[PDB]
């Protein structure tokens, strides 16, 4: 009487008259609605989803009857429970459907008959957008009701009688509800609004219950707490909210991270918590994550909030500034040594060993100190291979460029050291590149000043955004004219001249003359020994006009558009450069020394478990407003 296609129509039509009678029919033939040959073959869908998906106007009275029929078959447990085994819906239930439809009335229902509030909606649809999915919310009904802007459900699901989803439950990634609100928060007004509300709500609510470990401390299956998870994913609205979190009510004051130490008229101190932000070695920290492992698109807005700017500046005072200016002179000196050993390197004979002299032994100190730097920069970069390397480090203006060139410098000293010992006399040519490359690595050390460091950033952008597109065209013209102009010179199959005849080097030198010529550095000085002399002169003039008057002076113009556009952007990169410099120094210290330079002051912010105080390191920031008396 009721086949598979029969019912899915009836319930999809949502009219509880045509279905009546399937109750006694099914009871007789020894069936239960969940049975295989009554539910869809592809997904695994049954009557109850199809009712809810095709819900209309907010209600549909088929469902209380199909559920009334459920206990008659005795499948309520199995009936409001089902893994759609579709590889796009691996775990969706009627409760996942009840909530996303904003259908409060049935969400109260479906849980009341004791269904589930923990089903892991693990389907590829229900994965993050980078796994090839559409909507991650966690994987749970409570994590959904939060992530779908439904406060009423979320309140209910907790303080509902029958069953309740604890606010602690982890999905199949470790991520709880707060982890999941960080996964769906974009940095828009409307999104950041209702994320922060519910984030607080559950966090303040979960303090009432389980008056123990904060739910914000629940690490997921890669550690990263909701704050650490926002810092890695670039979510300012939640990230900013968490740090300057000042709750006042006596119970939930351990949840605040911005205190009110003292005030006196229009001057107001304040005291931020650095529990996660600054952890010298013995914990993961937000600040390491931002400066190294995060979204580069907004990392400057992350390092420009409440302690983070003044916490790095404080490290710069203590050790950051000093140790950086030992690194520079240590490097500038090492390049003096690599210079003097090159100006006193001999130039006659296969390997110029024959030292046996106070000078040549002094040169020997030079090459050895050099090779020490090359093997150093080689290992420190390959240490970074098993450590901080493998982002897209080929064109970043945040030390991605120099990691290569110090590696090139490192390789290129090793090869010269290999050939100076393997007899080969091109130790020199390979060294010469290493030397020019090495001084051009001292631009790394312009990072300790906005003045010189912003400048060095504009050099490299202009080198990318402005100079390559210029050489593409410039080259393209040059082979065009040069070939065109070589064609108009008589061979030396004629009288052995270059300045009248052409043979075997005439192309190559023109490329240099036509290079000197556009640079404003060579003279025409018409060759004039040509079959057609007047066509020749007409072409060089078109080369000057196009390449000097028009391309190279347009190149100045384009730079002016570049430096105007990338000035601010270069100020913001430098702040990432500068911060990266500080932590590269800090990480290079032992832990006890990092704790000696520990930034902030220990404070009893308040009282906690059995009167135990809160010994939270914090960072004072005095402030003035002549407005909020
Ligand atoms: C977008 C426009 C592109 C223009 C491209 C240039 C075009 C030129 C078109 C005309 C072709 C001329 C052909 C010359 C042929 C040639 O060479 O014939 C010769 C000798 O010479 C003549 O007989 C011509 C005498 C007249 C001279 C005055 C020219 C006035 C030119 C005015 C216009 C200048 C444009 C200037 C550049 C402006 C560019 C601005 C935009 C920027 C983008 C490019 C071969 O001698 P032969 O007897 O075989 O043997 C040698 C014996 N002997 C003669 C030396 C005793
Ligand atoms: C407002 C405050 C104003 C104060 C301003 C003046 C401050 C001056 C501080 C100067 C000291 C810091 C610089 C030292 C040199 C340094 O650290 O050089 C670093 C590395 O060094 C080392 O590896 C050597 C290890 C030993 C260092 C400490 C020795 C000095 C100890 C004295 C500290 C003074 C305080 C306490 C006492 C210590 C005892 C325990 C506490 C007791 C209670 C107080 C250079 O960087 P590098 O790794 O090359 O850069 C990155 C390299 N990479 C990874 C990219 C390849
Ligand atoms: C990932 C990097 C690794 C590099 C790979 C290259 C390594 C090794 C190759 C070297 C060996 C090849 C020659 C072996 C045979 C030989 O010795 O051949 C010689 C001549 O050979 C050469 O001259 C080879 C050219 C060397 C330079 C290569 C490029 C070096 C690296 C280039 C990159 C660095 C630049 C940067 C530019 C700066 C601007 C950037 C700004 C960027 C700003 C952002 C024959 O002459 P002969 O007198 O007979 O020699 C004596 C022989 N006898 C008689 C004793 C047996
Ligand atoms: C191999 C042996 C080498 C022996 C050591 C030789 C070098 C020692 C370094 C001496 C300086 C370190 C202490 C600085 C403390 C301090 O006050 O640092 C800073 C201020 O100063 C600096 O930024 C360094 C000023 C420029 C140095 C010139 C180059 C020196 C090397 C050549 C405190 O932050 P702030 O004022 O917020 O920084 C903002 C920077 N702004 C606006 C004030 C300039
Ligand atoms: C308050 C002051 C206290 C002073 C304490 C002095 C303590 C110790 C002195 C020795 C310091 C050595 C520290 C080296 C730290 C280091 O690792 O340095 C490296 C730099 O490469 C080296 O060092 C090469 C190695 C060979 C030794 C140096 C040359 C030979 C010895 C010279 C020492 C004596 C100097 C100068 C003497 C004349 C001074 C005139 C003052 C005048 C003041 C105005 C830091 O590069 P990195 O950050 O890792 O960046 C790499 C790039 N990447 C990967 C991050 C992109
Ligand atoms: C390459 C490695 C890394 C290098 C980094 C350090 C480089 C240089 C050190 C310079 C430090 C001082 C500059 C601070 C400027 C500043 O902080 O602000 C600048 C203001 O600049 C100036 O007014 C003029 C600047 C030029 C002064 C010249 C004297 C210093 C050099 C020493 C003398 C050299 C001669 C001769 C030597 C003797 C020879 C005898 C042997 C001869 C052979 C026998 C911009 O301010 P603003 O517009 O607010 O922009 C924002 C920047 N802000 C404040 C946030 C950082
Ligand atoms: C994608 C296609 C790439 C194809 C590349 C094919 C490469 C080579 C083919 C040539 C093979 C022969 C060369 C042997 C080398 C040699 O030794 O040749 C010499 C010839 O003399 C020279 O001085 C060398 C002149 C070289 C000509 C280059 C032409 C133009 C090449 C253009 C390549 C660039 C493309 C594009 C630029 C894009 C720009 C925008 C960005 C777009 C990005 C996609 C042999 O001397 P010999 O005969 O013994 O004596 C001299 C002659 N005499 C006296 C007997 C009459
Ligand atoms: Na000129
Ligand atoms: Na000249
Ligand atoms: Na001249």
UniProtKB/Swiss-Prot annotation:
Motif (Selectivity filter): 520-523
One example GO MF annotation: calmodulin binding
Compartments, record wording: Cell membrane; Apical cell membrane; Cell junction, Adherens junction; Cell projection, Cilium
Any GO CC annotation of this UniProt entry: cytoplasmic microtubule
Binding positions (ATP): 45, 50, 54, 89-92, 101
One BP annotation, GO: positive regulation of ERK1 and ERK2 cascade
Entry superkingdom: Eukaryota
Catalytic activity: Ca(2+)(in) = Ca(2+)(out)
Residue ranges crossing the lipid bilayer per the database entry: 323-343, 361-387, 401-421, 426-446, 462-489, 535-563
Keywords of the record: ANK repeat, ATP-binding, Calcium, Calcium channel, Calcium transport, Calmodulin-binding, Cell junction, Cell membrane, Cell projection, Charcot-Marie-Tooth disease, Cilium, Disease variant, Dwarfism, Endoplasmic reticulum, Ion channel, Ion transport, Lipid-binding, Membrane, Metal-binding, Neurodegeneration, Neuropathy, Nucleotide-binding, Phosphoprotein, Repeat, Transmembrane, Transmembrane helix, Transport
Coiled coil: none
Outcome when changing residue 186 to G: In SMDK; decreased protein stability; no effect on ATP-binding
PTM-bearing positions, type Phosphotyrosine: 106
Keyword check for Endoplasmic reticulum: yes
Cytoplasmic-facing ranges: 1-322, 388-400, 447-461
Membrane side Extracellular: residue ranges: 344-360, 422-425, 527-534
Annotated consequence of substituting residue 124 to P: In FDAB; poorly expressed on the cell surface; mutant channels show a significantly reduced response to agonists
Disease: Brachyolmia 3: A form of brachyolmia, a clinically and genetically heterogeneous skeletal dysplasia primarily affecting the spine and characterized by a short trunk, short stature, and platyspondyly. BCYM3 is an autosomal dominant form with severe scoliosis with or without kyphosis, and flattened irregular cervical vertebrae. Spondylometaphyseal dysplasia Kozlowski type: A form of spondylometaphyseal dysplasia, a group of short stature disorders distinguished by abnormalities in the vertebrae and the metaphyses of the tubular bones. It is characterized by postnatal dwarfism, significant scoliosis and mild metaphyseal abnormalities in the pelvis. The vertebrae exhibit platyspondyly and overfaced pedicles.
Family, per entry: Belongs to the transient receptor (TC 1.A.4) family. TrpV subfamily. TRPV4 sub-subfamily.
Protein name per Swiss-Prot or TrEMBL: Transient receptor potential cation channel subfamily V member 4
Part of the intact protein present: 148 to 788 of 871
């Amino acid at each position: 009487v009721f086949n598979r296609p029969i019912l899915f129509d009836i319930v999809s039509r949502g009219s509880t008259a045509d279905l009546d009678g399937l109750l006694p029919f099914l009871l007789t033939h020894k069936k239960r609605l969940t049975d295989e040959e009554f539910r869809e073959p592809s997904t695994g869908k049954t009557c109850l989803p199809k009712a809810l998906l095709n819900l209309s106007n907010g209600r549909n009275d088929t469902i209380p009857v199909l559920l009334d029929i459920a206990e008659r078959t005795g499948n309520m447990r199995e009936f409001i429970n089902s893994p759609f085994r579709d590889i796009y819906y691996r775990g969706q239930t009627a409760l996942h459907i009840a909530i996303e439809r904003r259908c409060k009335h049935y969400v109260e229902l479906l849980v009341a008959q004791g269904a589930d509030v923990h089903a892991q909606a693990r389907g590829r649809f229900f994965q993050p957008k980078d796994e090839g999915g559409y909507f991650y919310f966690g994987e749970l009904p409570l994590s959904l009701a939060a992530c779908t802007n439904q406060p009423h459900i979320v309140n209910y699901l907790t303080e509902n009688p029958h069953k309740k989803a604890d606010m602690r439950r982890q999905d199949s990634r470790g991520n709880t509800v707060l982890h999941a609100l960080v996964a769906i928060a974009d940095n828009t007004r409307e999104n950041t609004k209702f994320v922060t509300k519910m984030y607080d709500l559950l966090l303040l609510k979960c303090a009432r219950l389980f008056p123990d470990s904060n739910l914000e401390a629940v690490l997921n299956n890669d550690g990263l707490s909701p704050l650490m998870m926002a810092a890695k994913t670039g979510k300012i609205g939640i990230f900013q909210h968490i740090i300057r979190r000042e709750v006042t009510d006596e119970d939930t004051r351990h949840l605040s991270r911005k205190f009110k130490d003292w005030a006196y008229g229009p001057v107001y101190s304040s005291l931020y918590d650095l529990s996660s932000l600054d952890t010298c070695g013995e914990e993961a920290s937000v600040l390491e994550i931002l400066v190294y492992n995060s979204k580069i698109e907004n990392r400057h807005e992350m390092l420009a909030v409440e302690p983070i700017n003044e916490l790095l500046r404080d490290k710069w005072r203590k050790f950051g500034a000093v140790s950086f200016y030992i690194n520079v002179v240590s490097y500038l000196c090492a390049m003096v040594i690599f210079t003097l050993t090159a100006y006193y390197q001999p130039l006659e004979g296969t390997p110029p060993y024959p030292y046996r002299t106070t000078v040549d032994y002094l040169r020997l100190a030079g090459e050895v100190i050099t090779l020490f730097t090359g093997v150093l920069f080689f290992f420190t970069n390959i240490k970074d291979l098993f450590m901080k390397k493998c982002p897209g480090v080929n064109s970043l203006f945040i030390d991605g460029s120099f990691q290569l060139l110090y590696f090139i410098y490192s390789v290129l000293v090793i090869v010269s050291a290999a050939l100076y010992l393997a007899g080969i006399e091109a130790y020199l040519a390979v060294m010469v590149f290493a030397l020019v490359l090495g001084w051009m690595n001292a631009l790394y050390f312009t990072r300790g000043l906005k003045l010189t460091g912003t400048y060095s950033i504009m050099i490299q952008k202009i080198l990318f955004k402005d100079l390559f597109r210029f050489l593409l065209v410039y080259l393209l013209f040059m082979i065009g004219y040069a070939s065109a102009l070589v064609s108009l010179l008589n061979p030396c199959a004629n009288v052995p001249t270059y300045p009248s005849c052409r043979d075997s080097e005439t192309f190559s030198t023109f490329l240099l003359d036509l290079f000197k010529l556009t640079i404003g550095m060579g003279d025409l000085e018409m060759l004039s020994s040509t079959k057609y002399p007047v066509v020749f002169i007409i072409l060089l003039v078109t080369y000057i006009i196009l390449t000097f008057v028009l391309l190279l002076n347009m190149l100045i113009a384009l730079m002016g558009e570049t430096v105007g556009q990338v000035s601010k952007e270069s100020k913001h990169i430098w702040k990432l450069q500068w911060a990266t410099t500080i932590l590269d120094i800090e990480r290079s210290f032992p832990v006890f020394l990092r704790k000696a330079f520990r930034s902030g002051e220990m404070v009893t912010v308040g009282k906690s478990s059995d009167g135990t105080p809160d010994r939270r390191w914090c960072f004072r920031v005095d402030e003035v407003n002549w407005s909020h008396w």
